[PDB]
Amino acid sequence: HMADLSLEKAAEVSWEEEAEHSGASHNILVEVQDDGTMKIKVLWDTPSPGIYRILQRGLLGRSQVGVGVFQEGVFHTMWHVTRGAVLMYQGKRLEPSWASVKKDLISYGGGWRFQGSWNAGEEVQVIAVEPGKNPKNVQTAPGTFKTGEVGAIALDFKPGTSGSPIVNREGKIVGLYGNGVVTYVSAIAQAKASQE
Amino acid sequence: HMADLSLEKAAEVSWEEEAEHSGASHNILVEVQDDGTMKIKVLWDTPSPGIYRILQRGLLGRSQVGVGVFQEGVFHTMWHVTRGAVLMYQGKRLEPSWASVKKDLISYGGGWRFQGSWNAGEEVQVIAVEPGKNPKNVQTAPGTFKTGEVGAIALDFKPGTSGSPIVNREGKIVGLYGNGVVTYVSAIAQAKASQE
Ligand code: NI
Ligand code: NI
Ligand code: NI
Ligand code: NI
Ligand code: NI
Ligand code: NI
Numbered sequence: 600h601m602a603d604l605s606l607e608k609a610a611e612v613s614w615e616e617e618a619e620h621s622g623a624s625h626n627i628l629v630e631v632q633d634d635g636t637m638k639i640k641v642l643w644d645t646p647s648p649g650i651y652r653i654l655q656r657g658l659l660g661r662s663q664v665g666v667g668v669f670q671e672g673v674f675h676t677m678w679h680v681t682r683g684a685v686l687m688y689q690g691k692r693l694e695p696s697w698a699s700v701k702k703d704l705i706s707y708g709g710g711w712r713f714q715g716s717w718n719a720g721e722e723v724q725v726i727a728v729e730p731g732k733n734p735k736n737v738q739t740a741p742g743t744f745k746t747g748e749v750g751a752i753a754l755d756f757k758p759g760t761s762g763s764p765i766v767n768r769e770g771k772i773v774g775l776y777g778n779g780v781v782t783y784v785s786a787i788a789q790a791k792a793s794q795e
Numbered sequence: 796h797m798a799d800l801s802l803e804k805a806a807e808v809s810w811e812e813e814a815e816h817s818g819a820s821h822n823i824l825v826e827v828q829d830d831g832t833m834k835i836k837v838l839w840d841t842p843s844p845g846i847y848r849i850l851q852r853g854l855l856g857r858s859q860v861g862v863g864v865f866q867e868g869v870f871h872t873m874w875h876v877t878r879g880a881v882l883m884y885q886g887k888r889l890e891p892s893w894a895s896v897k898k899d900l901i902s903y904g905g906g907w908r909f910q911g912s913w914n915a916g917e918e919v920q921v922i923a924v925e926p927g928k929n930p931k932n933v934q935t936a937p938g939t940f941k942t943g944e945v946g947a948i949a950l951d952f953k954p955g956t957s958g959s960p961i962v963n964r965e966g967k968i969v970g971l972y973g974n975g976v977v978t979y980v981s982a983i984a985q986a987k988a989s990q991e
Contacts, residue, residue, distance in 0.1 A: 679851055701852070780855045
């Protein structure tokens with residue numbers, strides 16, 4: 600006590616063409632033409648951008664309590680994973696900068712950096728970083744639910760995977776794979792990016 | 796902010812004879828005899844003892860981030876679930892009293908109350924309280940792992956189930972269903988009970 604959490608890199612962010620699809624249904628955008636054709640449409644001194652495991656030292660070894668993403672020197676994860684705890688990376692203490700309990704989000708080292716917005720009917724990929732597994736891209740079709748109207752995803756991952764990022768076809772992050780309500784769906788948890 | 800977590804009762808603690816068994820293997824104690832027979836051997840002003848869901852208010856509704864147990868007026872859960880956050884029960888604020896980051900445990904309202912110790916070769920039941928499911932007793936045979944030598948369990952539950960209690964045949968709690976290392980095993984997370 601304290602400084603019980605530390606980070607370890609696990610992957611880079613990208614959309615994988617030909618990633619595995621999972622889910623009840625697919626959303627497929629079709630282009631129809633009048634001619635009868637139908638078509639299915641320097642080293643920086645900053646933490647290296649990527650996906651990282653958030654790890655807590657336990658009795659059987661370090662267990663993964665969640666995942667997050669460094670982008671532009673800012674670490675983004677879920678509020679329930681750390682609750683504002685300092686994070687150790689390379690001997691350095693990372694202090695929290697911004698949080699939204701309501702969206703279940705938090706950033707360390709600056710304000711929310713993600714710019715992606717998800718659009719109803721598009722499919723996304725979750726870059727699931729499950730405890731003891733290699734990162735895996737899972738293509739899925741979110742539904743929407745009303746309140747902001749929110750994307751929600753019906754996929755089931757191991758405990759500790761929350762904070763894995765959800766990317767669109769451009770490879771931009773549209774949110775983080777959240778905790779769910781239950782018919783287990785997780786919100787696409789996103790905030791607006793920050794400014795001076 | 797703050798007081799984002801609240802509790803809701805879900806079950807009582809007991810061993811269920813004839814609960815579902817799950818796991819790779821069974822440990823069965825056999826009694827052999829020389830004669831050729833072989834045998835398979837007032838309302839209190841305190842929170843009501845039981846198993847409770849620990850809930851965080853999100854955008855899709857309240858999500859379950861973990862489970863804990865009131866016993867003798869003390870609430871016991873996992874350190875990673877709350878990290879010492881106040882818990883709301885019936886309008887009242889519950890403040891943390893004791894924690895062990897190393898065992899991943901915390902109690903609110905007093906010191907650790909559980910007296911159960913698990914013994915190599917005995918089977919136990921996890922009273923799994925998964926998000927959106929009814930409590931379920933799961934009988935399983937832990938292995939042991941060395942460091943205290945610790946029971947460890949190979950069962951997979953939904954995110955949010957950690958803190959569910961593990962009971963022996965007498966209905967006493969031998970620990971709480973922990974976070975795992977990964978071959979995903981969770982520690983039987985237990986501490987010695989407390990004194991004046
Ligand atoms: Ni401290
Ligand atoms: Ni399919
Ligand atoms: Ni989680
Ligand atoms: Ni506050
Ligand atoms: Ni069996
Ligand atoms: Ni957990």
